[PDB]
Write a protein that binds this DNA or RNA. Structure first.
Lengths: 205, 86, 127, 80, 82
RNA sequence: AAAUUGAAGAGUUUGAUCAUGGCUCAGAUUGAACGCUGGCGGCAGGCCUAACACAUGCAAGUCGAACGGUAACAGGAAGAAGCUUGCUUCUUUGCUGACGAGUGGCGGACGGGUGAGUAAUGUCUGGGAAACUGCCUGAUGGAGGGGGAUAACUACUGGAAACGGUAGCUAAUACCGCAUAACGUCGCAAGACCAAAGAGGGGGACCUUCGGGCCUCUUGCCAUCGGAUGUGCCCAGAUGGGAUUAGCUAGUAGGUGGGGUAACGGCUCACCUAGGCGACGAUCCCUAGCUGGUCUGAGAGGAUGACCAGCCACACUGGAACUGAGACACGGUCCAGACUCCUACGGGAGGCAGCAGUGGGGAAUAUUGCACAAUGGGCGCAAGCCUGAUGCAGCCAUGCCGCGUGUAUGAAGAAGGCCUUCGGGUUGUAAAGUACUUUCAGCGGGGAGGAAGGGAGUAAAGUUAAUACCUUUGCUCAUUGACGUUACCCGCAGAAGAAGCACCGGCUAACUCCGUGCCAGCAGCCGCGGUAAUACGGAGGGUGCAAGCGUUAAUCGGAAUUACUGGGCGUAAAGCGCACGCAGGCGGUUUGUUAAGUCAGAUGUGAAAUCCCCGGGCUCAACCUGGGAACUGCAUCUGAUACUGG
């Protein structure tokens, strides 16, 4: 139910950094970042219209750690919801607990944050939530529970976090290891070389 | 029958059947006497017979052997015809 | 007909084991099938014994079908070869009567009765 | 409260009965054209006052025969 | 006769009852005449959990409808609540 | 506030083209199966085939507060004794807590199963009038005085069994007279006529035949008029196909009268009239349970009727009625048929389309489980008893949803493999190493909720002669969970036990080498294979999915490819060889009228669930749930009169 294999392969295939490692290292010193995996990585894909749509959807999925079934269901919900579907898809992803745990800096990666969640190290409103896809709401307070507070992963995670751009819609107290999901992120909060409308196109045909 | 009470019910329903049959046969007899008088043209015999019949079609109604409406028609019908002749 | 029987705590744990024994028994079944056919090392029989008789057997008891078949292979000779096809655990069935329909054979049982669906097939075609 | 039908007399042969035809236009469920449909009713005509071709007003009542559950209310137009 | 009782809906281990007026012979979750309340035994009790149209319940009693042991309890409980 | 605010195209005829036209693909969906693989959980689903046949258990009982009663076990007792003098065992007696068998009452018409039959004594929508209706309910009165029986039992007797035969004998809320009898039935009226039953709980003077009287309350019984629920009946529209089926019909269509039903009715019979149905599809033939809804589609449609709910029909096959408020009875009766079982040979017995289970058929569909704790049904004043309804558990990846199978760091980037122009590229931060986490599975510890009630006491009110009893409502005490090792929480051990499947020529995301050589083989469509095959088969690499993945089957979509929305017929499939013409469709222009079509409004109905919208509850989700909106439909009334019809 989770992708467990090599991670930089995914970045290499999509042509971009997917933040699947902590960021302690320039990614180009860990892999040949600008070349696809495999014997024929140097080869260029003269890539069909379907192809660009597929790869964009894969990219987003691989960023958030979501497999097809759940992600399709995410599209369905984005569509049902009011307002722009493409933007609704990203709101839903960005509201996941494993994700939010990552953005408050409690985990070096979404993979690490997910493990924190699954392993009962995260509370929401002082209540233990251990499922990664838990949808987090405005004004919620997610926190590292007392016993998980001395984990060195978390301190390192918060350090790296302090060096990333700081997300607007979250208020994080690094000392308490608690943080507040102030509001749903706008579209403008999220990276601009994500092409949701391509993903929207892939799932309407 | 297979079930204990099913057996008992068949026994009771047979008893009731022979009870009802007996009273029902009696009743129709007393109804038939009236129609027979009518068909012979006698007011008195037919009125007399109607008077014997009345209390028993009424009673068998009260006793559930027949419904009230049946008792009534019989009285209505015979009364109609006997009057129409004398 | 006989074997070692062992009880287990849970059935789910014993499902894979039971299916495992089937795989081995099936693998050797196809193994013994390939050998006997390839053993002749020729496209046909070297002589005129090719004429054979087929039989279909279903016995009510499992102990007999393995035991009497061994005695049924004793009467076999070089001239006329007899072979058993589709030994049954009991009674008779549609696919059994169908088995005797494809290849002409006698349908016999140590002890058996005809099913309602079995009579219709046997009475219709000549058997 | 006087529910009623209007139609014309297609048969007056029977003793104290009549056959009345009620005709109406109906939108076709699939192809939209408006189609004529007819409903023939066995109706009671005590006194046989209804002539064939007459236009008559009828009402629904209890069963009067195996096929009659309607009786005459009054004649409207006659002998065209 | 006509009775007022609980038809058990909800899910396995999470009972949820629909209070209904019905001919007592019909199945518990089958044909009913009128729905008249509900009863959640698993309500958090932080908010609601038991709602009865007492006006229609009484109307039906007035016409001889009987009442479950469990509905007879709910009614005394709800009458106490307010 | 919101609540249908939604719609894609690709390959393939040709040397190439445009058109025509079929085939094929991308999508959703499934009660699925098979092949490979397979960790946990929540919720759902699970004989689609043979309405084939079924061993065994269980699935309908209950009331001693209707009745005679004791045979079991349980005490109790004058009196027998265990006697070691208060502990007792048996002989006895229903004395009573109870209770086998019996009469009696209520239930066996519900609940549960199936879809064979049925194109209509069906269903859906909407209306009618001639009716009955147990239990529950409001109203008003009865509940008087008698009689003959009978099961049980006793004696004698026949049977292998099933089950009988004689004569005794006895009870009742069993059964029948007699009285009483109207706001009941018949009748214009005068009049005439119809019923019943007791049983318990407690008790003050009072007293006897010590049974009770009598006092009191509960409950059942009878009558009549209502309510509520259920059911029967009637009309209209709609609800499959076929003309290689065009005529059909004697109870037939109607009328009169008698009979009949709970009730209208050719329901039935006699007589009379000669009708009734049919091209707006009768008759005949084929097929089929109908609906809410389900799947698909932007919609209009198309397909469909498991699981949930409503109606119908059936209960081995054909027929029949008896009992009853209700049945022509799913575990009742009778006859006939098919079939099976028992037998001491003479005779008997049964009907899983209830729940498990078996054989058979099949590509294929589960355990001969636990519990009445909860909801609900039957009986009972109750306690309670019964409940394969139901709640649960087992089995299966069948589906949906959730989670895991680790996280981070880790380079000249090892070995091995693979490609290479031998420079190197790749597998690949992948692995090893380094720290780090412990969900789930394992193991110990603790521990919600589903529980409302019911039981003893107590107190107050209504009762009443009464503080009894009864009933209601408060109080305390001790109690009731099949699931269950529950949900959930804490602790321990270690990355430890948890990854496979299909694909990579174009459509279509993913390319190379070796082997083969029109072979072996692939193939949804085009089309691959005779020496460079990205198409066969293996490998390395890659793509897509992931506890699944593929293949097959199946509906709709794309298919504007049955075209109502939404197409065509000169040469592509398609104008009858030509004309006349009935039915039918359509019909110039003016006025008046009508108001069926059409339009408007109002009212009722359109079950709930489902779908959709906004909320609420399970850690999330599936799932459960509140309210709304929607059900685009039907019907009645009242209007409007331009258009269509008269």
């Amino acid at each position: 139910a989770r992708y467990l294999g090599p991670k930089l392969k995914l970045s290499r295939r999509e042509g971009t950094d997917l933040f699947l490692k902590s960021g302690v290292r320039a990614i180009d010193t860990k892999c040949k970042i600008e070349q696809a995996p495999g014997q024929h990585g140097a080869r260029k894909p003269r890539l069909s219209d379907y192809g660009v749509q597929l790869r964009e959807k894969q990219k987003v999925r691989r960023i958030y750690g979501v497999l097809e079934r759940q992600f399709r269901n995410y599209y369905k919900e984005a569509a049902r919801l009011k307002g722009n579907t493409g933007e609704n898809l990203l709101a839903l992803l960005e509201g996941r607990l494993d994700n939010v745990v990552y953005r408050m800096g409690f985990g070096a990666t979404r993979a690490e944050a997910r493990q924190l969640v699954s392993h009962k190290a995260i509370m929401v409103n002082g209540r233990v939530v251990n499922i990664a896809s838990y949808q987090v709401s405005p004004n919620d307070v997610v926190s590292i529970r007392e016993k998980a507070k001395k984990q060195s992963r978390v301190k390192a995670a918060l350090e790296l976090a302090e060096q990333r751009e700081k997300p607007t819609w979250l208020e994080v107290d690094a000392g308490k290891m608690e943080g507040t999901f102030k509001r749903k992120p706008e579209r403008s909060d999220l990276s601009a070389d994500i092409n949701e409308h391509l993903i929207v196109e892939l799932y309407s045909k | 029958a297979n079930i204990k009470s099913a057996k008992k019910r068949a026994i009771q329903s047979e008893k009731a059947r022979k009870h009802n049959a007996s009273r029902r046969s009696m009743m129709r007899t007393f109804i038939k006497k009236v129609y027979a008088a009518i068909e012979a043209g006698d007011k008195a015999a037919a009125q007399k017979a109607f008077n014997e019949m009345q209390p028993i079609v009424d009673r068998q109604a009260a006793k559930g052997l027949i419904h009230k409406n049946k008792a009534a028609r019989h009285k209505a019908n015979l009364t109609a015809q006997i009057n129409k002749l004398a | 007909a006989g074997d070692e029987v062992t009880v287990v705590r849970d059935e789910k744990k014993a499902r894979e084991v039971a299916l495992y024994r089937q795989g081995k028994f099936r693998e050797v079944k196809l193994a013994r099938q390939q050998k006997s056919k390839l053993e002749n090392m020729f496209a046909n029989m070297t002589e005129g014994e090719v004429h054979e008789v087929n039989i279909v057997l279903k016995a009510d008891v499992q102990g007999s079908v393995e035991a009497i078949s061994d005695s049924l292979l004793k009467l076999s000779t070089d001239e006329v070869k007899v072979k058993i096809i589709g030994s049954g655990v009991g009674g008779i069935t549609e696919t059994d009567a169908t088995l005797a329909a494809a290849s002409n054979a006698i349908l016999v049982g140590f002890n058996v009765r005809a099913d309602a669906s079995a009579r219709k097939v046997i009475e219709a075609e000549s058997l | 409260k006087i529910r009623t039908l209007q139609g014309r007399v297609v048969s007056d042969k029977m003793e104290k009965s009549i056959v009345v035809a009620i005709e109406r236009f109906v939108k076709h469920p699939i192809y939209g054209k408006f189609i004529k449909r007819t409903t023939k009713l066995h109706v009671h005509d005590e006194n046989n006052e209804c002539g064939i071709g007459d236009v008559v007003e009828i009402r629904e009542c209890r069963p009067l025969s195996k096929t009659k559950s309607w009786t005459l209310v009054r004649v409207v137009e006659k002998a065209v | 006769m006509v009775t007022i009782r609980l038809a058990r809906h909800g899910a396995k281990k999470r009972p949820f009852y629909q209070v209904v007026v019905a001919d007592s012979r019909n199945a518990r979750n089958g044909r009913f005449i009128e729905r008249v309340g509900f009863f959640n035994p698993i309500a958090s009790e932080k908010e609601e959990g038991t709602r009865l149209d007492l006006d229609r319940i009484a109307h039906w009693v007035g016409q001889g409808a009987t009442i479950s042991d469990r509905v007879a309890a709910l009614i005394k409980e709800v009458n106490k609540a307010a």
